[PDB]
Design a protein around this ligand. Structure first.
Ligand code: ZN
Ligand code: ZN
Ligand code: ZN
Ligand code: ZN
Ligand code: ZN
Ligand code: ZN
Lengths: 307, 307, 305, 305
């Protein structure tokens, strides 16, 4: 059987080979606790240590499964999608119900994540998220409902495949460049560029925006209204920010659909970057990484058009 | 025919009786430009003037249609749902495509909004949003896609009815108290309590939260991760805030599903309020209004359980 | 504690495998029939409806375990025929009860909570699945395998369940339960109604065979807004003019088949099904045919229930 | 500018009513047939496929105007039979071209942009509607009246259109166009395949009539994961054992009908349709039957296309 490494970032989602013994019949599992934290507290340090671990141990194993909380799983998955250089399957998985709760979802989630990680056909598709019998790509996947076990969905382009009876039918694969095809290399980095997110809505204070500028943040992501629009006070602070060196990326609070370039706002005029289908938290991820390569908004836009 | 008043808050969404003449065959339309602004700039002053106008003119007409931009329509609609005391239909409508663009959606949107406003069966259901042949309640309706004409949907409980050939079949009506059944009365108010929204994600700065506290904001709404969870730095600032008088409401960045009380966080312990199915921008609306009645988080929670 | 009766129609969906039930209700159970839901039939429907109506005053609410294949059919039939205003809640499982992360146990727990909540009464026959309370009319099966498959695709759910509490924010407008004019206590059988499908180059043979067998009604799973392939139209038009009740529904999973849109229904005596999908339409047409054979009266029924 | 040919099969969906087309392509048009899409048939399919394959080297891409009722059927049939790798894009309108806010004009503009974009080639036959580029296999009609009805309910769309530009982020894995073993140039007719529906108490009469008429294949719109009402099962089992190709699909709008799950397919010679809904399954079974009558070979086809 294939040997799959399980990297845990927190508690157990099932309760591992003893908690879900059926696992030892499809893979050879070793487990390492890499960090232990709730995902609402996920952070840069954790991201860096994970990417490095996966990159160092790529040849010690046939695949990876990462147990992680659901709240920020979608951010971690995209970070790794951009930084892992192991074309072998890296599959993330979590659980929406506590492991001791009735009809706990963890056990079967874990099983299906190991199934996915172990299938050769899963290789070379970038980092994946596996939940609710579905194989989801790290870029587009996002949490759609606060409590539903079916919460994870790729709301713009769809899943990569479905899992029935330990088998996967892949009918899709992502087009946006990832893993070995990106120029990102966090292997020597101990920190990441500071990027914050500000929200837009009626009568929005500019204060949040101004705090980030005061603190010399490297980038700021705007969760805009509609097609990335900005409340005027926020538009003014961000315009300013962009002229004094803070990268500014326009995304949207609207859960699906792209924030398009030169549509609602003149990005070229202000030196802003439109995030495409990257929601705010995902846009933060690429902006941070783009900032380790360049600070030219034109080049940041190009990065946003390709990753 | 019934006489319907169209209150415009910005430009035309069609191009009114001359731009969509079919209108004069279903209603008697008068139009007033109440303000002229892009909805990304929507604000308290506009909300107050609209509520008052609708309340003053309730007996001058059989119904209201409000033309408004799409970016914050969902916020205005809920504000009015809470403050209008005219049980007559108040129907909001906007357009996702410019009026001069091919297959402009405005014309037929406007027509269907007038159809809705004119149907007696539409009365007593609170403030409505009409878009894409659908009648949506002001509380649950939200913008789901950045550009799609079908963007407005009530993502937790569904629409109230569908519109085919100028006819409506209502199969639902909202249960949460609105209009005349709320204690909110902005008729004498010239300002609203200050409420801001802060976003949570991996490695979230507490700075935004702290700016609002520094400025003596009355309330703060957290767009949390998952079931309203908070990044630790943000959790600490907000906990503090709540002890020194800032109302704190936990909502979620996740587009559907409720942020439940005493689930992921101990709201009772910290004096926080869980927003139920109110997304961040909608939660801001009720929190602002709840703040004109009380500052006791227990009572704010009760308000969040009933409106 | 509330008395709740679990009426089972098949195999179990849990396994007490859910001891936590003692915390919310006094539970007793009866195996009413035992079949795979894909073989659900008129006899089961009649007996179920009669059992609930007969037993209404012995318990505080009912939970009905049922396979997922035709849960949406039974739920609507019960929605139209139950004369008990106490909560009737149907429940199933998408995963075998012995499979890992089986959904049955929590689904069942949630159904008893729903059946026992006093706020659940007077909302008609309910279906509880994946933490959601769904009305029997609009509820349909949306995905072949996903635990979250049950959704009310047109009008949404009535309420969500978290930690054993329901936040109801909706109730259906279409009349059901004791508000309908249907009465199963007098029926040992139901009018014959079949369903035919429409698609490119569709044979009229299925429709023809139904008519030849003297079927009381036929529901057309049409294309788009209830349209019909030419040959199927031709056949059903004659049928409707000669006494067969004919209802236009649609193969399209959401949205209504409207009146006076695509087809001139009055001209032929056809009835438009509204938001009722073909299998749901069938439930209502069978029932309407126990009350009348008149197309206009049947359309009225379809506009009301 | 690119040469794009618009092949019309019905009434127009715009009305130049869209002069803005001159900005993106040199357009010429031919009325290939003229019918309501609810009467779409084998003859139209054959002629369309032949026309595109014959005319492939005269233009840069094709746009096909087609009614919405069976757009998803034609699109898949073309997906399986077009041997031209240039973009073929189907397009419709959900509102009358003269109604207010008609969708046809912008839909058409978007289809020509798609047909003319060089990045659109080699993705198979496409359907463009509501600013979205959708593959012909997974695309289905989701709502009876909404302009946004066309969606790829299982795997999503290939790309979105904004301001005349497409951000393609997906392409289908299932082989299509010249990769299939089908060849319509040799066909004046297609094998007879009908579709029967399953639901509670389903009559076996439709299935029986199809078999009696010597149908080459039958697709079952089953319940849940492709299951069958007892009587329909019994009939199709005999049919499959005696030479009728039988494909299990599902009435359920999303998700696959899987192999070796609910039914022992090999035991009877049934074929599981995968994510192919009944009308789509029919398209592929008709085509498979022009190549073989062997169930295992047909299942292989269903696992590949
Ligand atoms: Zn990727
Ligand atoms: Zn309301
Ligand atoms: Zn009902
Ligand atoms: Zn009643
Ligand atoms: Zn294809
Ligand atoms: Zn090829």
């Amino acid at each position: 059987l294939p040997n799959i490494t399980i990297l845990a970032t927190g508690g157990t989602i099932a309760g591992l080979v003893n908690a879900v013994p059926q696992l030892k019949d499809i893979a050879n599992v070793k487990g390492e606790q890499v960090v232990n934290i709730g995902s609402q507290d996920m952070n840069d340090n954790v991201w860096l240590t994970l990417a490095k671990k996966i990159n160092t141990d790529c040849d010690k194993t046939d695949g990876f499964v990462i147990t992680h909380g659901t709240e920020t799983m979608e951010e971690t998955a995209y970070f790794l999608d951009l930084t892992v250089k192991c074309d072998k399957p890296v599959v993330m998985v979590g659980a929406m119900r506590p492991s001791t709760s009735m009809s706990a979802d963890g056990p079967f989630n874990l099983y299906n994540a190991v199934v996915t990680a172990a299938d050769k056909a899963s290789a070379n598709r970038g980092v994946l998220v596996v939940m609710n019998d579905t194989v989801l790509d790290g870029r587009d996947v996002t949490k759609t409902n606060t409590t539903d076990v079916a919460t994870f969905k790729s709301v713009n382009y769809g899943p990569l495949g479905y899992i029935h009876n330990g088998k996967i039918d892949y009918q899709r694969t992502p087009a946006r460049k990832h893993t070995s095809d990106t120029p990102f290399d966090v292997s020597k980095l101990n920190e990441l560029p500071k990027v914050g997110i500000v929200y837009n809505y009626a009568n929005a204070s500019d204060l949040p925006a101004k705090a980030l500028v005061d603190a010399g943040y490297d980038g700021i992501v705007s969760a805009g209204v509609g097609n990335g629009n900005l409340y005027k006070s926020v538009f003014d602070t961000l315009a300013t920010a962009a002229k004094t060196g803070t990268a500014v990326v326009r995304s949207s609070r609207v859960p699906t659909g792209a924030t398009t370039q030169d549509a609602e706002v003149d990005d070229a005029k202000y030196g802003f970057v439109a995030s495409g289908t990257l929601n705010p938290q995902k846009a933060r991820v690429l902006l941070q990484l783009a900032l380790t390569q360049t600070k030219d908004p034109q080049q940041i836009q190009q990065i946003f058009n390709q990753y």
